[PDB]
Amino acid sequence: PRYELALILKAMQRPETAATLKRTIEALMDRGAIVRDLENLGERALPYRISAHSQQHNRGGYFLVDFYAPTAAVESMVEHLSRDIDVIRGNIVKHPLTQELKECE
Amino acid sequence: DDPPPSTLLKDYQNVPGIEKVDDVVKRLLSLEMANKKEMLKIKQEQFMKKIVANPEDTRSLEARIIALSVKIRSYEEHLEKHRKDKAHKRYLLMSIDQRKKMLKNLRNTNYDVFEKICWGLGIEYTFPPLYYRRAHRRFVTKKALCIRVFQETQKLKKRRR
Amino acid sequence: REVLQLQEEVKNFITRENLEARVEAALDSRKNYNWAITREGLVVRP
Amino acid sequence: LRRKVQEGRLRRKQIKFEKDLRRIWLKAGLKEAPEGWQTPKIYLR
Amino acid sequence: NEDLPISMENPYKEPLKKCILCGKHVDYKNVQLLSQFVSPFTGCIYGRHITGLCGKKQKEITKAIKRAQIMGFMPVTYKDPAYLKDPKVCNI
RNA sequence: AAAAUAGACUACGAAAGUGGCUUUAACAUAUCUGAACACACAAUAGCUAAGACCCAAACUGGGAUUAGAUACCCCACUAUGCUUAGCAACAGUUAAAUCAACAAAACUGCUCGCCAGAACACUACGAGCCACAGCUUAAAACUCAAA
Ligand code: FES
Ligand SMILES: [Mg+2]
Ligand SMILES: [Mg+2]
Ligand SMILES: [Mg+2]
Ligand SMILES: [Mg+2]
Numbered sequence A: 001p002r003y004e005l006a007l008i009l010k011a012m013q014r015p016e017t018a019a020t021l022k023r024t025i026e027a028l029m030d031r032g033a034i035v036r037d038l039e040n041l042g043e044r045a046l047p048y049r050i051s052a053h054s055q056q057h058n059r060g061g062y063f064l065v066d067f068y069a070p071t072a073a074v075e076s077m078v079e080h081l082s083r084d085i086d087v088i089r090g091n092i093v094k095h096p097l098t099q100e101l102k103e104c105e
Numbered sequence B: 001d002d003p004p005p006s007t008l009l010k011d012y013q014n015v016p017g018i019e020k021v022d023d024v025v026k027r028l029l030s031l032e033m034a035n036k037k038e039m040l041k042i043k044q045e046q047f048m049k050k051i052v053a054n055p056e057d058t059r060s061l062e063a064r065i066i067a068l069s070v071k072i073r074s075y076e077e078h079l080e081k082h083r084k085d086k087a088h089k090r091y092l093l094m095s096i097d098q099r100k101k102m103l104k105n106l107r108n109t110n111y112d113v114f115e116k117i118c119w120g121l122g123i124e125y126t127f128p129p130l131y132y133r134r135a136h137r138r139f140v141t142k143k144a145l146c147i148r149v150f151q152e153t154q155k156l157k158k159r160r161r
Numbered sequence C: 001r002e003v004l005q006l007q008e009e010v011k012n013f014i015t016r017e018n019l020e021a022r023v024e025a026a027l028d029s030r031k032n033y034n035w036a037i038t039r040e041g042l043v044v045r046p
Numbered sequence D: 001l002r003r004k005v006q007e008g009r010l011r012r013k014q015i016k017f018e019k020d021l022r023r024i025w026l027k028a029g030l031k032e033a034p035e036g037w038q039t040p041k042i043y044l045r
Numbered sequence E: 001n002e003d004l005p006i007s008m009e010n011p012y013k014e015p016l017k018k019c020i021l022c023g024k025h026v027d028y029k030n031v032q033l034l035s036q037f038v039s040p041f042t043g044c045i046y047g048r049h050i051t052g053l054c055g056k057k058q059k060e061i062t063k064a065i066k067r068a069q070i071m072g073f074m075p076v077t078y079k080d081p082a083y084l085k086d087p088k089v090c091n092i
Numbered sequence F: 001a002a003a004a005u006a007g008a009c010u011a012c013g014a015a016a017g018u019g020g021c022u023u024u025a026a027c028a029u030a031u032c033u034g035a036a037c038a039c040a041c042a043a044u045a046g047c048u049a050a051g052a053c054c055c056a057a058a059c060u061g062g063g064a065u066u067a068g069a070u071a072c073c074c075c076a077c078u079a080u081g082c083u084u085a086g087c088a089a090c091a092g093u094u095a096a097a098u099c100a101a102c103a104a105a106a107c108u109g110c111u112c113g114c115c116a117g118a119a120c121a122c123u124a125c126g127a128g129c130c131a132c133a134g135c136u137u138a139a140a141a142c143u144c145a146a147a
Helices: A014-030 A071-083 B023-028 B036-051 B061-081 B086-109 B111-120 B137-160 C002-010 C019-027 D002-028 E031-037 E055-070
Strands: A002-010 A034-052 A055-068 A087-094
Touching (some): A002 A014, A002 A071, A014 A034, A014 A055, A014 A071, A014 A087, A034 A087, A034 B023, A034 C019, A071 A087, B061 B111, B086 B111, B137 D002, E031 E055
Antiparallel strands (some): A002 A055, A002 A087, A034 A055
């Protein structure tokens, strides 16, 4: 199905951010995904302090990866996000646009 | 056996020009990138085409039996993995009993379709027991002895004659 | 219509060839999903 | 004291069961039990 | 007789009014909208008697708020000060 | 470990029950009634192997107290609390005189289960199941004019 990955990455310099994004998208494709688009929401202060990989973070870069993957890939992808040191927090959800906008009256 | 993952979704098989699209579009519109329910729908239509006379009629008893059979297979597949799911064990057992009732009705109403369903879905219809009584230890032992005594007496009678 | 729309959209997908270019273009861009609502039910674009 | 009575009743019950089983094959004409038959103790753990 | 009354539904009935958010998509990434339905001082989610939303839209807003809070998009204990000047849509 | 607000919501499930977020599976049945004996659940505490043990604590000891002390306060430590592996229903009506009473307004149709004074008796015996305690089914004699 269609999924959206919300990725909060470490506050890094542009080459490192690009390398991390490339590694993540390559992992997605390796797990059988067709990546549709990549969108940058910007770098911002985290709503609260997040501890990851024995480091404390107060700022981060927010990215969205829209893609199509088999249902079995998602779990696999989650595990990969658990291991990458540059990812403060990675969450895969069903793409918001797939849910039908039933029109109340 | 499950449909190959390359099979197109049921809603994207009769659309014109579906053979003239890119390989990526074919992947996007295949069973590989859908939930299990689409694969179950493909199984269901395959069974309908292979068994029923009119594959479009879904209100018939045989169509309902096919649908319940596909659902029973899905529950069994679910329960191979979730051995401690009691609600789905209940659903599987209820579905099997309901399918038995539907098969009884089909047998009583249309025997040819009953045979075709039993062959197509590999269902082995079974008749209900006549008496519902507890087989306690004493009865079981006594019955075993009676069978043995009958066997020995038959051997004695055959030899003596 | 859905099939044709998908076929048109697949052209502008992130393949393994245009991965670097699209990553850099994304890093050189910003999108906003924030908007607000008024008592009259009107969307106030930032 | 209820115990010894209870196991005594179990023993008499087992004897009655064995007697019924013996009656069966005796009436069937077999002088002895079926070859390889042994009455199990079904009333004792 | 043409002067007799006729069977009819109440023509003077006022239709149920639509809420501010019906027909609009609620996204967990839209922290600006989700911040219009929480307490500025505690971050607690306002009820439907305060927000005035329907049951369906109240449930959607609650789900989006929880999702954004745990996905690292929204604060839990307070309202983000960047959104304190947004239009007030809550009767409190 | 269990989940403030939402929830002034009343939804999901056969019931027991289910209220943090994401994802994957996924919520039987086109008539109804109809199992003690079949299969699933359920809650109920207690045992059998192991393991952990901060804290609490049935029992077991010790300290202090009236004039049979505090059963009651203090200390220590067991089983255990923990973690696995196991053993009336359904369908209609509001028309009638509503209707012993109190409960919970009355009734119809149809089916199943159960009941024919009290006590003997959640008993004895038999049978089944188990098995330290047992559970289900369930009488008779004597007695009474009541209950
Ligand atoms: S008015 Fe449409 S969901 Fe509330
Ligand atoms: Mg029934
Ligand atoms: Mg009944
Ligand atoms: Mg008894
Ligand atoms: Mg008796």
